[PDB]
Amino acid sequence: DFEEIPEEY
Amino acid sequence: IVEGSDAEIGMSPWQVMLFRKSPQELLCGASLISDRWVLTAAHCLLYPPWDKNFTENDLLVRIGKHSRTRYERNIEKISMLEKIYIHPRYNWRENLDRDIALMKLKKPVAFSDYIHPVCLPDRETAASLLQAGYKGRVTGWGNLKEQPSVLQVVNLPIVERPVCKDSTRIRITDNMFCAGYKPDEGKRGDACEGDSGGPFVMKSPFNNRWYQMGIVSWGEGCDRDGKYGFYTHVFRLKKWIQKVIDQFG
Amino acid sequence: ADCGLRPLFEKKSLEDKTERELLESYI
Ligand SMILES: CC(C)C[C@@H](N)C(=O)N1CCC[C@H]1C(=O)NCc1cccc(Cl)c1
Ligand code: NA
Ligand code: NA
Numbered sequence: 001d002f003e004e005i006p007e008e009y
Numbered sequence: 010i011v012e013g014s015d016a017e018i019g020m021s022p023w024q025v026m027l028f029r030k031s032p033q034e035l036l037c038g039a040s041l042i043s044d045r046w047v048l049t050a051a052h053c054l055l056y057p058p059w060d061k062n063f064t065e066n067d068l069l070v071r072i073g074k075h076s077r078t079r080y081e082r083n084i085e086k087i088s089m090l091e092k093i094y095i096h097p098r099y100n101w102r103e104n105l106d107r108d109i110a111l112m113k114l115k116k117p118v119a120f121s122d123y124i125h126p127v128c129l130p131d132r133e134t135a136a137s138l139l140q141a142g143y144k145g146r147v148t149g150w151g152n153l154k155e156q157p158s159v160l161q162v163v164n165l166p167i168v169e170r171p172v173c174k175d176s177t178r179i180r181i182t183d184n185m186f187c188a189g190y191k192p193d194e195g196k197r198g199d200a201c202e203g204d205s206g207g208p209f210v211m212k213s214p215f216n217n218r219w220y221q222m223g224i225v226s227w228g229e230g231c232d233r234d235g236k237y238g239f240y241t242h243v244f245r246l247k248k249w250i251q252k253v254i255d256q257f258g
Numbered sequence: 259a260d261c262g263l264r265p266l267f268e269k270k271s272l273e274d275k276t277e278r279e280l281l282e283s284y285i
Binding site: 001002003004005006009 | 033034035069078079080087089156
């Protein structure tokens with residue numbers, strides 16, 4: 001249910 | 010948080026989300042205590058009965074959040090861990106005595122309207138405020154019942170040590186305190202699964218600053234009548250906190 | 259040295275909706 005976070009992290 | 014309310018924006022700017030990298034999920038709450046140190050529950054990182062043992066690289070810290078699941082662009086900041094420090098006498102085998110851990114961040118976080126550290130108590134604030142009936146505040150993204158869209162808040166009174174002790178078969182220590190309403194009080198509320206590691210805070214009426222007196226540690230069930238949530242007593246473990254920070258920056 | 263003062267509340271002299279509940283319990 002979690003929105004994807006920026007790849008960078 | 011059971012029977013709490015939605016947080017106001019910026020109400021708890023020290024609130025930290027411990028986040029699993031894969032599968033991406035909430036692991037725990039936590040709190041910001043400086044631009045490079047985060048405080049949490051040891052059991053968030055190490056709990057062998059449940060085969061939990063995280064390393065630095067397993068995790069991220071998300072600071073400045075409000076929404077649980079949303080990526081809050083231009084507001085939250087996401088940080089990598091440099092090092093985890095667990096209390097050397099953390100008792101995971103029995104009653105989570107000394108349930109406390111520090112996390113050092115790779116890089117300092119920029120403070121903002123939504124990101125700001127909480128204070129840690131000195132002995133005199135602790136003595137003034139840690140009194141039966143005095144209320145603190147607990148915040149978290151954990152279960153609403155034994156999950157929310159946004160950060161939840163609940164205000165709960167500290168309970169007398171005999172009543173804490175008589176509520177449970179677990180051995181309680183001077184490194185813990187319990188909070189919550191009694192059956193006869195009406196009002197209710199508690200921490201629950203996923204609120205682990207989050208802060209119990211109090212606003213000092215002497216200097217009008219927020220202090221973190223406790224860490225969400227353990228309970229039997231959530232919001233059960235006659236049961237109470239148990240919190241790590243932060244002032245009792247401040248010597249260890251200071252040593253760590255002093256020794257590793 | 260600025261800990262525990264929230265930018266959107268104490269720094270602005272704005273109070274949140276339930277902090278008075280805590281103060282009233284500090285008897
Ligand atoms: C003493 C402990 C072995 C009891 C256990 N039910 C427990 O609370 N645990 C076992 C490992 C994690 C922790 C937990 O679930 N804490 C979450 C929680 C739930 C309700 C209230 C609070 Cl204050 C904290
Ligand atoms: Na007992
Ligand atoms: Na209860």
